[PDB]
């Protein structure tokens, strides 16, 4: 855990796609989330009760990490990707959002650069992914299929 | 709910594998998590606000149950088991971790005994399960498959 | 610094004051905090196979 947490950040999209579990494992487990799960009492805890302001700040940090995690999982579920780090969809690429070939982006761009190129199309793409899944379920409820 | 919560604890691994929903259902639902979800206000709540230390202790207990649940679910997701109480993997058994035949462990050992036999190989096994899933995804991204 | 001085071209430096925050800026200048955003999308040749 955290042995190369953002190690692929400067690498290409292709190479970086091979380290996806590395970042996923660090979204729900900060130091305080490890101390909170010791078999022994952590001892510190009395401090956070005697002084309730510190107790509240710690809980807010823990609750937020959980809420952010769950929201990303909910979107993957809605889009039809329950689990999987990499999933294919039926939404075609518009070639307006970005107009580059596969041999250019997977080999020459980093994920940070990509993110800064299509950031204002994010909501359009997410909207289409949701519509696609709804259409798929409508087709599933037809026993003659395709 | 809680009608035989650890009832299989003294039973064999084989028999105990048939009660897995019994323990799973009790990880997110303690008494306070039921009172918190009443249609009526619980009434007690004012106590936990007037005296903020008790309010904080209760939240810490609730947040922790959620964090522990989610961490186990994240590991199952990483290992390629989204959902399912029982899942098969591609990691071979080493016969060093434990060197017993199937007819000995499934019929004669309890899960508590098993846990005390291979506890210091837990991290090795978990590491291998993650590597296995990453290798599987690398193979999935090949349209000629196997 | 005081400001400019004369045509002799000199500068005068004095011990300064300022907010206590300048003491922390001397140690934390190397650090930045960022939020990690794990989802993203990109073009590929795969298509969900409907089964």
């Amino acid at each position: 855990v955290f042995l190369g947490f953002l190690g692929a950040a400067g690498s290409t999209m292709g190479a970086a796609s091979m380290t996806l579990t590395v970042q996923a494992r660090n979204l729900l487990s900060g130091i305080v989330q490890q101390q909170s799960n010791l078999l022994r009492a952590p001892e510190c805890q009395q401090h956070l009760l005697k002084l309730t302001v510190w107790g509240i700040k710690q809980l807010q940090a823990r609750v937020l990490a959980v809420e952010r995690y769950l929201r990303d999982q909910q979107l993957l579920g809605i889009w039809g990707c329950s689990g999987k780090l990499i999933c294919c969809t039926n939404v075609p690429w518009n070639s307006s959002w970005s107009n580059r070939n596969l041999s250019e982006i997977w080999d020459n761009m980093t994920w940070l650069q990509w993110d800064k190129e299509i950031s204002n199309y994010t909501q359009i793409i997410y909207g289409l992914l949701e519509e696609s899944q709804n259409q798929q379920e409508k087709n599933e409820q037809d026993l003659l299929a395709l | 709910v809680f009608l035989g919560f650890l009832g299989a604890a003294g039973s064999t691994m084989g028999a105990a594998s048939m009660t897995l929903t019994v323990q799973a259902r009790n990880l997110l639902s303690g008494i306070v998590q039921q009172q918190s979800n009443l249609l009526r206000a619980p009434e007690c709540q004012q106590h936990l606000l007037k005296l903020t230390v008790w309010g904080i202790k209760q939240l810490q207990a609730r947040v922790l149950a959620v964090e522990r649940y989610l961490r186990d679910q994240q590991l199952l997701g990483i290992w390629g088991c989204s959902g399912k109480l029982i899942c098969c993997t591609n990691v071979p058994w080493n016969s060093s971790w434990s060197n017993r035949n199937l007819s000995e462990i499934w019929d004669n050992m309890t899960w508590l005994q098993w846990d005390k036999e291979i506890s210091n190989y837990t991290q090795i096994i978990y590491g291998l399960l993650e590597e296995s899933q990453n290798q599987q995804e690398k193979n999935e991204q090949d349209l000629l498959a196997l | 610094r005081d400001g400019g001085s004369t045509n002799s071209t000199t500068e005068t430096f004095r011990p300064g004051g300022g907010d206590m925050r300048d003491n922390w800026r001397s140690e934390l200048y190397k650090y930045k905090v960022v939020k990690i955003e794990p989802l993203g999308v990109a073009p590929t040749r795969c298509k969900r196979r409907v089964v």
Partner: antibody
Amino acid sequence: EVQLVESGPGLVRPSETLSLTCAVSGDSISTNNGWSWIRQTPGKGLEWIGYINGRSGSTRYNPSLQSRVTISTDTSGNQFSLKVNSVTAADTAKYYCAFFWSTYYKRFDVWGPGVRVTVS
Amino acid sequence: RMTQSPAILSLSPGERATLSCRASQSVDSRLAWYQQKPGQSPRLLIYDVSSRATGIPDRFSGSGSGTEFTLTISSLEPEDVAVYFCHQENDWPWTFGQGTKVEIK
């Protein structure tokens, strides 16, 4: 970038096994899955024979030859080969060595010149 | 599992040539086209119905889905005399159509 060079008998008799090989230059065959054989038969057109996965040794064969063809590798020689049993006149064809790359990110082929084989 | 049509086209230089290919079963979007000149092994032109292979002139294009596909060559040149093949990439048998010829006069 690789080059594929086929070689083998240009004549096989009825009920004999036909054996063709392909050398690979420029890359390894112990990896790079998708080494394959393609047959071009006058009067029928193109069809696949099958392919091999250099990393595992597994193979897949077109059902018409499920009981007739073997594909295997010589990773030391960095060459691979095709053997078809019980060859008959109907199997006269131009045989090719090919490399098919098909992934989520790239698609390409490399073809060798092939071997024309007469079957009596 | 796919049939091309017509067996042969004969076109004037600069004219646009079109070849159709029909599947017996859906092949989704997994269709490739190849160009085989006499004495040559087939060259990949188009993959996934409309994506050009690296090194292919912009004369070449195509479209289609499911079972109905077309290969188009605009501004046809004498160097395009070849047999064009329709290749199925949506199933295990990977069949090919029979191949059609385009000749420039």
